[PDB]
Amino acid sequence: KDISNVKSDLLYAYTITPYDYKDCRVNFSTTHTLNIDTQKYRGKDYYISSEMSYEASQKFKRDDHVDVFGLFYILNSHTGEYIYGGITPAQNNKVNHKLLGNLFISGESQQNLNNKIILEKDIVTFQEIDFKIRKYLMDNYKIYDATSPYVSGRIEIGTKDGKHEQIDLFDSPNEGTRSDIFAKYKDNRIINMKNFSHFDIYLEK
Amino acid sequence: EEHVIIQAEFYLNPDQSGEFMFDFDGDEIFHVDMAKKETVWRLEEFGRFASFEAQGALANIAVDKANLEIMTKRSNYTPITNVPPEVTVLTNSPVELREPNVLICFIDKFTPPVVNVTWLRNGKPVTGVSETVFLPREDHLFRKFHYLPFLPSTEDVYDCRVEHWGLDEPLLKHWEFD
Amino acid sequence: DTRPRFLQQDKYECHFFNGTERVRFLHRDIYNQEEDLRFDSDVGEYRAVTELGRPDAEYWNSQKDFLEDRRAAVDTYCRHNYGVGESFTVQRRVEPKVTVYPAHNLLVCSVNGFYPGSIEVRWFRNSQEEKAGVVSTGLIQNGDWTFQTLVMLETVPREVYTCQVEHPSVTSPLTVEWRA
Amino acid sequence: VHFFKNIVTP
Ligand SMILES: [Zn+2]
């Protein structure tokens, strides 16, 4: 899977506007799924179906109020909208978290990307964090452009406990479609900013 | 205070020699060589666990030199008070005939990080190399460790000859089995 | 050689408390040996430590920018590096190695090649932890991430006294008896 | 692999 193909798949996959509906009800809840009534946003009888692992698929339950933030993998499907994870306990009080970050490029000098990304939730999904950082990286470093040098790199989510969680930046499994690329988000993994220390970026070539 | 990591770097004149390093809880995690421009691990195995862009440290050094000039003047040209080094020679392990060992010559509490150390067996100088870089002291002085692997005996009498612009005469240290 | 020397030391230091619960960053500009300029998280801006360093303080403090980068080192620098080395520094353990040899008879217990420096050495006689009449070299830095220490016991021989050593790299206390 | 980060001196 020559990186050359990896890259374009990501570029194309990630050139997208996320679904970002705030404080919506959960109509029903199963395992694989979780129904959310995005009625006060899109339209009459519309909604959002978030696909997610069992573990995660069971913490939420009907009537629940939640925040959606997911990258789609299918469209023009009537009244429905489908994503993987992207669900966190709704945020009630306004907040703002300027993220701190280091940008190491194999070859160039250290550079830091502090306060260049702002999260507006206390509890957030790695999806949401992963998305914005990538979008930023794209918008300025063109990390997925056919011409971009970078042959590889990753994201490290630094916690205050002193640990890092990797998130490969050039990884296109299977066919390499938004469905393949965006299904790792099933785990609906989240994080509490009280524990987010900083993030690190690594780019080779 | 459970642990302390220190990024210690200096620049001296007219020697025009810098040094950059990380000190963890006491030891040198690693240092950058201004000569070969290559990060050097105190423990060769560390490199397998982490990397550090050598080029980076040299940048600072550049800056540091400059700060020296801009500070040298600002201080109305007042040099550095030489501060003699307190030598001392311990042993890597309980000496026992023929069984390989190491003589350690711990130089500590000196400040102009400039020194000269010579090893002596019976009396004639002995050479290969083996030494650390100027480690920092909470009082901004220095301590350096020099080494010499020897094969214990009883005939030989080793010597660590420390030369510093502190003592008006070289500093010698004797050592031998029993 | 009489040529004067002009030194310039810079120490960027990280202090960790309870793992990485709460850290502390501190930058120290040092001309020759006096700490003239400073900067502490607990403070937030550069402070002068000696008149010689004020000119700079006011300067850098005028660049809000550069001052945010330093304010964020407890995160992007300290906790980070702590965690980048974690594996081979804080979690480093290296089993000692004790031997016994006679220096009022003489006894000397040598603990070599261990790490960390937190360690405990004991002298027992048949059935009692004799804590009296024993001098020690204290903990000594070797330069290669390993310590050493010698505890000198002072007693008259006859029986069988032994050194008992317990260090964070071995749960079951290590032992070495000496036939007297 | 990981990278130790150094405080850039301005
Ligand atoms: Zn980090």
Short mmCIF file of C-alpha atoms and ligand atoms in Angstrom, two decimals, chain A residues 102 104 156-159 162-164 197-202, chain C residues 75-77 79-81 83-84, chain D residues 2-3 5, ligand 1:
data_model
loop_
_atom_site.label_atom_id
_atom_site.label_comp_id
_atom_site.label_asym_id
_atom_site.label_seq_id
_atom_site.Cartn_x
_atom_site.Cartn_y
_atom_site.Cartn_z
CA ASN A 102 4.95 20.38 20.02
CA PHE A 104 8.61 17.64 15.61
CA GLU A 156 0.57 11.83 20.49
CA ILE A 157 -2.11 12.76 23.00
CA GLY A 158 -0.15 13.80 26.07
CA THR A 159 -1.90 13.37 29.38
CA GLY A 162 2.74 11.59 31.89
CA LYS A 163 1.57 9.27 29.13
CA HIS A 164 1.13 9.44 25.33
CA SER A 197 -1.62 17.96 29.16
CA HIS A 198 -0.50 18.62 25.60
CA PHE A 199 -0.04 16.88 22.26
CA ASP A 200 2.96 16.05 20.12
CA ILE A 201 3.21 15.86 16.33
CA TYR A 202 5.79 13.86 14.38
CA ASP C 75 3.17 20.89 29.91
CA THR C 76 4.90 20.87 26.52
CA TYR C 77 8.34 20.46 28.08
CA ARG C 79 5.58 16.37 31.68
CA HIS C 80 6.55 15.59 28.11
CA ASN C 81 10.23 14.83 28.66
CA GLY C 83 7.20 10.76 29.88
CA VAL C 84 9.73 10.49 27.06
CA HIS D 2 9.95 9.58 21.09
CA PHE D 3 11.94 12.83 21.01
CA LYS D 5 12.16 18.37 23.50
ZN ZN E 1 4.49 14.69 24.80
#
